[PDB]
From Swiss-Prot:
Tissue specificity: Highly expressed in liver and placenta. Low expression in heart, brain and pancreas. Also detected in hepatoblastoma Hep-G2 cells.
Effect recorded for residue 138 to Q: In a colorectal cancer sample; somatic mutation
Catalytic activity annotation: L-cysteine + O2 = 3-sulfino-L-alanine + H(+)
Single Gene Ontology BP annotation: lactation
InterPro entries the record matches: CDO_1 (IPR010300), RmlC-like_jellyroll (IPR014710), RmlC_Cupin_sf (IPR011051)
Protein name per Swiss-Prot or TrEMBL: Cysteine dioxygenase type 1
Family listed: Belongs to the cysteine dioxygenase family.
Functional description taken from the UniProt entry: Catalyzes the oxidation of cysteine to cysteine sulfinic acid with addition of molecular dioxygen.
3'-(S-cysteinyl)-tyrosine (Cys-Tyr) crosslink site(s): 88-152
Cofactor(s), names only, from the UniProt record: Fe(2+); Ni(2+); Zn(2+)
Subunit structure: Monomer.
Cofactor note: Binds 1 Fe(2+) cation per subunit. Zn(2+) can be used to a much lesser extent. Ni(2+) can be used to a lesser extent.
Organismal lineage: Eukaryota, Metazoa, Chordata, Craniata, Vertebrata
Alphabetized UniProt keyword annotations: Dioxygenase, Iron, Metal-binding, Oxidoreductase, Thioether bond
Length: 187
């Protein structure tokens, strides 16, 4: 496995692996995982908020992907969401996230069904797309933060959030807390 020694190495490699038309999912996953999280390299992007997690743009991958860092305060979690027909890679940089995988709802209304539950380990890279299922991720800790590196290809700025009680869904426009280490207007 090609082991990037720095976040910068990993980004350069990513530009090669997404330069073409095909993407070897397991090759990407292994290389993201092989990178050893180093907070000196990504602390400029780790910008937290009191009440909810934040999305922090790192690189735009020449239109081919979004690379961003997500900052999970104590107890912070996401809704149940889809990924708008893209590849989605999630690598742990600090702390631990619990991923819960959900089946897709019918037209009927009722409780949503869990298909899988796991804790992502240190430096682990997970993979999901809409054919794998829906998921929710959350910080397992109420005393420590979590930080994750996400890659979305193609990039997207809208998804759906699902009500666990009924399976009903709403369209959600995602926003960035910061881009390239610079804070965006209005949190
Ligand atoms: Fe997700």
């Amino acid at each position: 496995v090609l082991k990037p020694r720095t976040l910068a190495d990993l980004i350069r490699i990513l530009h090669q692996l997404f330069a073409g038309d095909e993407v070897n999912v397991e090759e990407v996953q292994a290389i993201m995982e092989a990178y050893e999280s180093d907070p000196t390299e990504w602390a400029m992007y780790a910008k937290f908020d009191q009440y909810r997690y934040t999305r922090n743009l790192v690189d735009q991958g020449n239109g081919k992907f979004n690379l961003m860092i997500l900052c999970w305060g104590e107890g912070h979690g996401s809704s149940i969401h889809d990924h708008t027909n893209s590849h989605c890679f999630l690598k742990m940089l600090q702390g631990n996230l619990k991923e819960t995988l959900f089946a897709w709802p019918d037209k009927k209304s009722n409780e949503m069904v869990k298909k899988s539950e796991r804790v992502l380990r240190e430096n682990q890279c997970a993979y999901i797309n809409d054919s794998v299922g829906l998921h929710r991720v959350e910080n397992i800790s109420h005393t420590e933060p979590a930080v994750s590196l996400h890659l979305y290809s193609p990039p997207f700025d809208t998804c759906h959030a699902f009500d666990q009680r009924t399976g009903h869904k709403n369209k959600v426009t995602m926003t960035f807390h910061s881009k390239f280490g610079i804070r965006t207007p209005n949190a």
